[model samples]
Target: ATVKFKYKGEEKQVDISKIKKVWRVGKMISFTYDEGGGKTGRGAVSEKDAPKELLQMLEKQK
Candidate 1:
């Protein structure tokens, strides 16, 4: 599934499986994803704005 959220006032989307790591800091949810090359991309979304499905998926990764 595509995780959709607002980041820095812009819309962002990333696949669930593509996410290599996910963690939360206070109300901020942060994640990193494999970005095609050897590089990885980092993203952050507020807990309230993030979909519950995405949160559950991240929780299962732990």
Candidate 2:
């Protein structure tokens, strides 16, 4: 399933199958993913700008 995360009313989708790790630091919500041999480094967004479902997503990480 594609997890739809919103930040500042902007919608973004992450394939659940592709997620290697999800975490939070301070006000930054970050995630890690690896597509085949290439791995995506930590990607993140600030709490001041985020999706409605994003908090829930990060909660699971916590």
Candidate 3:
């Protein structure tokens, strides 16, 4: 299972396990992912919009 949300008004699904790094400041969350090919992807979302499990994992990185 995964988490789903709307990013920039577009639906996006994130497999929480693929998350690499996390930064949480209040409801602000910045996440980095292993996008492969020696590349990475990062984005931010309000905790209010993040998935429950995603938030749980991010807490460990707190």
Candidate 4:
């Protein structure tokens, strides 16, 4: 599984297994995905654990 999002107007992608942690604040779940070299991306994960909105936004670049 993978989650993708836009960062600084650039499309960034990350593998779900690469996610360092998942945190929830109120009703929102935040996924923190990162690479050791200071590269990282984050997005809200749905209650169903799907990143539909984020992926859709990135797929628009296709």
Q: Pick the candidate with the highest TM-score.
A: 1
Q: Clashing pairs in model 1?
A: none
Q: Per-residue lDDT for 1-62 in model 3, tens only? A: 56555678887666777777777876577878766667787767667777677766655643
Ranking by TM-score: 1, 3, 2, 4
Q: Write the per-residue lDDT of candidate 2 for residues 1-62, one digit (tens) a residue.
A: 44544667777666766777666787667777665676574456566544566556656743
* Per-prediction TM-score to the true structure, in the order listed: 0.75, 0.48, 0.68, 0.44
Model 4 TM-score is 0.44
Which pairs of residues have clashing backbones in candidate 3?
none
Better structure of 1 and 3 per TM-score: 1
Cα deviation at 35, candidate 1, in Å, is 1.8
Compose the digit string of candidate 1's lDDT tens values, residues 1-62.
67776957888777787887778887789888877888787777788777777767545744
TM-score of 2: 0.48
> Considering lDDT, which of the candidate structures 2 and 3 is the better prediction for this target?
3
Task: Write the residue-wise lDDT of candidate 4 on 1-62 in tens digits.
Answer: 57655546565567766877665567656677766668676576544554654434333544
Residue-pair clashes per candidate: 0, 4, 0, 0
RMSD of 2: 4.6
Q: In candidate 2, how many clashes are counted?
A: 4
Residue 30 CA displacement from its true place in model 1, Å = 0.2
Query: lDDT score, residue 42, model 2?
Result: 49
